[PDB]
Curated annotation (Swiss-Prot), chain A:
Residues 2-115 form the Response regulatory domain. Disruption phenotype: Deletion of the gene results in overproduction of DSF. This is Sensory/regulatory protein RpfC. The modification 4-aspartylphosphate is found at residue 46. The lineage of its organism: Bacteria, Pseudomonadati, Pseudomonadota, Gammaproteobacteria, Lysobacterales. At low DSF concentrations, interacts with RpfF. The N-terminal input region plays an essential role in DSF perception. DSF binds with high affinity to a 22-amino acid sensor region at the N-terminus. The response regulatory domain, but not the HPt domain, is required for repression of DSF biosynthesis. The gene is rpfC.
Length: 115, 262, 261, 263, 113, 118
């Protein structure tokens, strides 16, 4: 499996890379740039990021995949467990939704579900 | 040559297949070919006095239509060429308005959507009187994602089906919707299984072919009541072009990424 | 004598029962309705009555089956556009009067206890409130003989549903049950068989306690969403021109419906 | 002083908190003049600075949003036969709510934050905004029929943007109250959030439309030339409203008096 | 502390039998509720002049305006689903038939507080 | 049972008449003629061919629906065609057709469905 993780915080990128082939990038705009060049099995993204957020990226990715781009499942991570935010993401195209800080065992099992 | 035209003169059914020589978007060539054929077919139908002809808008691509020529947009915006962008926008309006008023020959316009329809593509489907969609097809208006809005009649056509307020939301949210969802929202008229769209169109044609006087009369009633005036749509694209000209580098880069994907 | 009129002057409630003596809008029935509308409206205006109630009902086992098709067939075959236009215009005046409350800001209530087809359904839609009993069927079958509903179907439905859905309903020629129409928003209340009168009485009693509010709302309608008479008149102009162009297949269909009525 | 104004000039977000000096939460003459006065002031500042797609939020400092018209004032003017002053009040209420509808003449995004009950004019004021955020447990409705009047501050005009003309009529004449969840299903409210989460929900809406300011402003221009409610139309509706109010009897006036005391 | 309102003068006294104040009319119970506080109000649906539904609608707005909440139970000879429809959406918690069943009246009143 | 049959081809009318006599039958050439027959006499069930020139089976169903709501006696209609597409089956079912059977008709399936009616 080939992974692509995106988070604005420095501490979050490092802990996820150690427990998991992984590429890490900062913003939501950059993960859209990274996906345009390379192909990935799954994308892990933080919901609340400055500038462009997880949902804005999700909507933009949805139109890209509908335009012809190869499908990649997206799992979202967030501190907010609010039911209104979960519904909006899966209606934008999200396949999984996990709370922060995420338990390692449940992340790996949900990644195994996608394949 | 961007179109594949199938004509059935003895039955007065006419099929327009987009993207015959294949980005599956409304390029200048595709727009000119559509308007050129609309004008041609409409004049032939009028002089022959054909009552309630049927025109079908379909696609030869695996998508229906992905909307405006974004690569052209990026270029004209960066060059500051308002005149050419307005020209393009006005020609897109003429194309979709012609479907809305039945080519000036009181035709029944049917959109056959067997692949994804985005932006201008969705607007073109909405310009037809009947929308047939196949299961798994996605439609939406993603132009807000690069800080623009749908100016090819999205608002005008949706207001025929839903409230002005809900139409506004849909235009500004930038979500995609499945055929089943759009059916529930009243934005699509029929959803059929994959590869059954043609048969569904044939049933619609056969249904309205038996009531040609009723259809033609209803178009006259539309003309004098709820029909969207061409002028209204032209003024909407004026706003569209002025907005597009003010777009920044972040929007232009978003458009560039979509161009590469599309 | 096509109408049975029940007047309650001290309560200002007025009942119009169609078909007192084919249960369709004949010339006699139309003239009797418009004649009574004009009469009652003038009496209500001069007496300064606030928010009177007018009920459109039927003495037949159906509500109303629509236009006088036997008359249509004859005028179309004879090429008499002038008389067909005259009929169509008088039908418009009848249904528009219900829509604007007889020019006296009345509350118009349609009591539909039997089937309402074509013009019959249009007459129900011209009222402000539609009460239907279970098992009642309504629809617009004029497309089945290549015509369209020109007595305000489009104008009245556009008050309740979208312009696009209104178009579909007018061109499909399906019949709908009361329960279906309720879900579609084309009917306001569905009650069990033989309970319609009581349901109308509840509506009357409800709006009788807010007569100033009702009358003010009619004024607001007048200056906003109310259907202008002129608009409907121009729609029947298109209707007559279409009817005059009808072929023998349509005329035979109309003849078969005449015999079934 | 009936308003508490919070301005964020560098972000162009402006908060209007009603009932700042409640230490009856209705549209009093003072409150209406303060709103229109601020709308005119802020709108002129936004136009001259050429601000693109500013955000204006209508909120409340009371435990209710707004209970509607000043009924105590209504009772007095009706009993005195003062049509001129009642018309003046009604016209000023129209200007307040229409300004929200057209974005203060500066193409602003108007957001109603409803964290307490909104009745009559209060509900009409929420409906005048482009987006309505409501908290759970909040009740809204149009109770003016209960004293034989109707909502004349744009209820009909604003609801017709969201629902059918026929359903709008029913709601205006039934006099029922509806919960936030019910209004959401009816399409009369845009978002329902848990208690004490309204501000965060408004911030998400602001942040969402802040990234598409050109698209928002262009859409206002499109509204202006199509579906926007003309001021003149609303003015003529309040003319009918005042004439109706002047004809009200003692039973209606007593009903109004009882509501005044409960307020 | 009960407050009962009915148009029939015979129905008023028979409910008083099984800390209860009776009043005649729907406007009079509203005037009583402003005078002093009550625990629950039992009202007849079909009263001339002003009915139970109008009182419920009027109380609903008053309670939303700032008045103390008091639960309401409705009595009527009518039992149709279209009559309960309007009452339960106006603020009523319990619905009962006429003449009232003594067992269902007392039990439902205890469930409130 | 009293049966009314409509098919535009002579052979089809003949095979249907023969098999269901082993009921009383009247065979007619099209959709308009069965409607004319139903006004003159009453029938227990109508068997109609879907595809006929001029007026087809689906029109007849839609015309009968309004006629039956206008005061005409109700009578069951079963449709026959070599067209067995769900597209065509949906149309007839929506128009009030009680049964849709494939052509060439299976005698066992026709008679059992007719027995279910009355
Ligand atoms: Mg974060
Ligand atoms: Mg009683
Ligand atoms: Mg055949």
């Amino acid at each position: 499996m080939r992974m692509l993780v995106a988070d604005d915080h420095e501490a979050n990128r490092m802990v996820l890379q150690r427990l998991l082939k992984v590429l890490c990038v900062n913003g939501a705009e950059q993960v859209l740039d990274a996906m345009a060049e390379e192909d990935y099995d799954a994308v892990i993204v933080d919901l609340h990021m400055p500038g462009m957020n997880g949902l804005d990226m999700l909507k933009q990715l949805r139109v890209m995949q509908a335009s012809g781009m190869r499908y990649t499942p997206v799992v979202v991570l967030s501190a907010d467990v609010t039911p209104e935010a979960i519904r909006a993401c899966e209606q934008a195209g999200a396949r999984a939704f996990l709370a922060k800080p995420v338990v390692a065992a449940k992340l790996l099992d949900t990644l195994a579900d996608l394949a | 040559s961007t179109l594949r035209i199938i004509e059935e003169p003895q039955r007065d059914v006419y099929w327009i297949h987009m993207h015959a020589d294949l980005r599956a978007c409304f390029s200048t060539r595709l727009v000119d070919d559509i308007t050129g054929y609309q004008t041609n077919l409409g004049q032939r139908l009028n002089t022959a006095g054909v009552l309630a002809p049927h025109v079908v808008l379909a696609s030869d691509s695996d998508v229906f239509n992905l909307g405006g020529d974004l690569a052209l947009f990026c270029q004209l915006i960066r060059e500051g060429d308002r005149a050419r962008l307005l020209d393009y926008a006005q020609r897109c309006v003429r194309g979709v308005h012609a479907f809305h008023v039945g080519l000036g020959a009181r035709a029944h316009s049917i959109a056959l959507v067997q692949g994804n329809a985005l932006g201008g593509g969705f607007e073109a489907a909405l310009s037809c009187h009947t929308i047939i969609a196949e299961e798994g097809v996605m439609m939406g208006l993603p132009e807000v994602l690069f800080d623009l809005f749908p100016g090819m009649g999205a608002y005008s056509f949706m207001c025929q089906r839903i409230s002005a307020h809900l139409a506004q939301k849909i235009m500004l949210e930038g979500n995609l919707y499945s055929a089943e969802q759009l059916l529930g929202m009243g934005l699509v008229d029929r959803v059929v299984p994959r590869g059954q769209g043609v048969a569904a169109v044939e049933q619609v044609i056969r249904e309205s072919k038996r009531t040609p006087h009723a259809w033609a009369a209803m178009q006259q009633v539309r003309e004098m009541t709820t029909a969207v005036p061409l002028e209204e749509m032209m003024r909407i694209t004026e706003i569209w072009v002025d907005t597009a000209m003010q777009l920044g580098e972040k929007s232009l880069r978003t458009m560039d990424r979509l161009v590469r994907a599309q």
